[PDB]
Amino acid sequence: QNMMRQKEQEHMINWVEKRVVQSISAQQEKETIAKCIADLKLLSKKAQ
């Protein structure tokens, strides 16, 4: 049971990283930049 669980786990994570590296091309760049810019604003606010 334990061996099967762990092995399936690693295989699952490999498949999932394949999926994420594939989907990274998906067009979300603009909202990503917007949110990170807001985060920069928060960081600067804490900097002072």
């Binding site: 061996m3 399936e8 699952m12 498949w15 999932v16 999926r19 989907s23 909202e31 990503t32």
Partner: protein, 62 residues
Amino acid sequence: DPVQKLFVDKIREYRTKRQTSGGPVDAGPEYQQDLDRELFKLKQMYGKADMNTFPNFTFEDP
């Protein structure tokens, strides 16, 4: 909590994994051979008994 794109991305991809898991997905023969060898070493360490046979020793006396 959903704003972070990566979290939702991993969430949805794992969801897809779960639904596709109606049967285990993407075994690949390598999977089978690895199973073979690891089960072989496991049983060899344990023994050649059945999967679920409740045995007995049939005791004796000096």
